[PDB]
Design a protein around this ligand. Structure first.
Ligand SMILES: Cc1ncc(COP(=O)(O)O)c(C=O)c1O
Ligand SMILES: Cc1ncc(COP(=O)(O)O)c(C=O)c1O
Lengths: 437, 437
């Protein structure tokens, strides 16, 4: 009746991620109450919203006497340049140069409709079909998996990711056992054939990581920069939950840049996800590409998130908000979740990834009699929503890797009572599964 | 250095449109002042901004006592569904059903990051490579050109437009001659080999049209709807400037819809272009596609435009604003511009397209000794910026198309003094050209 192109058939195709996203969106839009521990929406932090309401009001009250011209109206009533809101870009240049001495200019920053829009651009700019120097497909290299589920399907044709599986070390957290950290396997990575065949167009990772809450160490990051410069490809770093804002990082870490680094940031995780504002810091050549892409796909990127954020970047309040209100909120939430998980399981073979950042806990059930896609169904049936591990391994076949079927992602951004009720159910279901064969 | 994919090379490649867009972006950002008649930004209408400012304040002042839980905060602090802001869609459902009785449900409406985002989806959804019935390219049929410059480059691979040239009839405007109206050449369109052979994926047009100000007639639209139904392809209609908002239409027309129609609206031309809100009314099948694409490309679309517009849709003030303030503002500006053009030229071979809508005047210099691309360069060097006609014929080889080198687009959204100064220079330069061989 209505014929779509090959392009349309790819976005119309059912997938494991597409079915899962339908289920998350169905509960959010439904009457049946649920224990929502499966989304990525930030927490409702009161001190944060009080600052945003003040900034909002101020933008509508700075007009000249008896005249329409408030900042709120100017931002609404006009298209930004395709590269993004000029004032916000200038504010960002000043901010980054004050705090890190990178010597940026406005040519080094672009805005997109959320970081997701930035990955849609960046992964189709450095992956997919390249001219053979007669056509050669190159991949985005994820040096460590599990990694962000949202990367998976952004390519315009086929799928173009290469991943290296991680080394697992059992570690300690707050004086107790039953924790672990994923580490980059440089033996596997440095010897990766795709890299020597010239089939890798970029390296990319999130810091801290969705879904694990893992923070790749400064030594791991410096090593990745060497590999990136060696193979003459950019190192893309997704700071959605990281420095300098919202700075939801609990372990020692430093933010760096050079002309070979592409740094992505967002306003979603400081509490402005409805605004859809991503920020890219890169070499002039990358910013030009993104700006041209915005011109064609979007005309101009959105600017209301840039309007609220601008004065908060100018006076460093965006940093104070992050360090004083956002970071502590999520740490107390993660500590409470760990406490409750250890009360439910703890005698059982549950491992919790060292919570070093972001808004999630990553739970690993060693030798569980069912897969975590199965646990996901059983928990959804009882009103508790979590995300199963098998969709966080883009670029690697996990049908033959059992660790990929033994974990779940749980949001610690949910309110206290949701965490209490959700973890109670997770405990009952899982204990009952371990107690029988 | 940095090496890009083929997809990327399409956006690095300087086209005629990217070089024109750079000159228009440079003129704005420059210290040198200019008579800016080349943009597409809507006018600053005081009555519109007063209503917007009131709405903005109201959304931030409906919090419960001593709390920051206002509508503005809720809208900022949460991702919408990938299909778009639920409340805004429900308001739109009610609104269209009140005014047109199309029996829509929420399944028929999706939101995008401006209508440009809608065209990037729709033209790639129904154009480019299709599975053959080993594969076959299909095009988006533009039943009459000139058409919107922004459609040109949205295809992911190559360019897939089949454009039909117009018939021209001399018409009158306000008791005066020196006007014309483009009309659909149904002989040429209905016999196009691509159409007969099944190589056209959809039909598309703007109503009113950028850059001409032309409104395709009710009879012309009915015919296109039959042709579309016959060939199992949808009719996409861009109402950026049309009914019911901003309703910048000065001639008799009807807004119609059915399941084979894809109606695109926008909040940009009512005065909120900075917010980036596109609206699509279509069959469920098309909306699901858009939703799935938003999920991958954007996570969710922007919502602050939705937040402002929701109450103005609920109480029909969006319609009253359009009819009482926006529509009359532009008619008086177009009238003023025509007056001024007839004082400058008028004795000369200037034809003006009958201004039936949108925010531009389309000027045709019969037998101009230079090309309008050349006129553009001369005016640019004397501080006045307009847009040359050769970029408004997507998919047409304009290298030996006389008519495509004889017109200019002029914005009548500019303030009065810009129109007086600009037209004065346009008059001097053009008269001087006609006066010598
Ligand atoms: C690691 C990570 N990066 C990027 C994003 C996308 O964020 P946005 O497009 O809202 O900026 C998400 C959000 O879920 C995420 O978890
Ligand atoms: C006819 C037409 N359609 C659509 C658009 C795009 O509007 P939006 O701001 O909604 O992306 C424009 C240009 O701004 C236009 O002139």
């Amino acid at each position: 009746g209505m014929k779509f192109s090959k392009f349309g058939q790819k976005f119309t195709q059912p997938t494991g991620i597409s079915q899962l996203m339908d289920d998350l969106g169905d509960a959010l839009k439904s009457d049946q109450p649920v224990n929502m521990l499966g989304g990525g929406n930030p927490a409702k932090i009161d001190a944060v919203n009080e600052l945003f309401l003040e900034t909002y009001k101020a933008l509508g009250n700075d007009n000249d006497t008896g005249k329409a011209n408030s900042s709120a109206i100017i931002s609404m009533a006009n298209y930004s340049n395709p590269q993004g809101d000029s004032a916000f870009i200038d504010a960002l240049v000043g901010f980054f140069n004050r705090h890190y001495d990178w010597n940026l200019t406005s040519e080094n920053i672009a805005l997109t409709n959320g970081s997701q829009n930035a990955f849609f651009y960046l992964f189709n700019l450095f992956g997919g079909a390249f001219v053979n120097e007669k056509s050669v497909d190159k991949s985005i290299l994820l040096p460590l998996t599990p990694e962000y589920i949202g990367y998976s399907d952004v390519h315009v044709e086929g799928q173009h990711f290469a991943a290296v599986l991680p080394h697992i070390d059992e570690v300690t957290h707050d004086g107790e056992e039953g924790f672990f950290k994923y580490r980059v396997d440089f033996e596997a990575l440095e010897n990766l054939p795709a890299l020597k065949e010239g089939r890798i167009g970029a390296i990319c990772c999130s810091r801290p990581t969705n879904p694990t809450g893992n923070v790749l160490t400064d030594e791991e990051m410096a090593h990745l920069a060497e590999i990136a410069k060696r193979y003459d490809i950019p190192l893309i770093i997704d700071n959605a939950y990281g420095m300098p804002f919202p700075n939801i990082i609990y372990s020692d870490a430093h933010l760096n840049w050079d002309n070979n680094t592409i740094l992505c940031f967002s306003l979603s995780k400081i509490g402005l996800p409805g605004m859809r504002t991503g920020i890219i810091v890169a070499d002039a050549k990358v910013i030009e590409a993104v700006s041209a892409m915005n011109a064609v796909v979007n005309l101009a990127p959105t600017r209301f998130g840039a309007a609220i954020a601008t004065p908060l970047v100018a006076n460093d309040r965006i940093k104070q908000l992050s360090d004083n209100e956002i970071k502590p909120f999520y740490q107390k939430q993660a500590t409470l979740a760990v406490k409750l998980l250890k009360q439910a399981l703890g005698d059982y073979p549950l491992m919790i990834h060292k919570p070093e950042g972001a808004i999630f806990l990553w739970l690993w059930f060693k030798d569980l009699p069912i897969s975590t896609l199965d646990l996901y169904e059983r928990l959804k049936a009882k009103g508790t929503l979590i995300v199963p591990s098998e969709y966080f391994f883009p670029g690697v076949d996990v049908s033959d890797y059992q660790h990929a079927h033994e974990c779940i992602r749980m949001s610690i951004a949910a309110d206290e009572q949701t965490l209490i009720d959700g973890i109670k159910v997770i405990g009952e279901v899982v204990r009952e599964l371990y107690d029988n064969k």
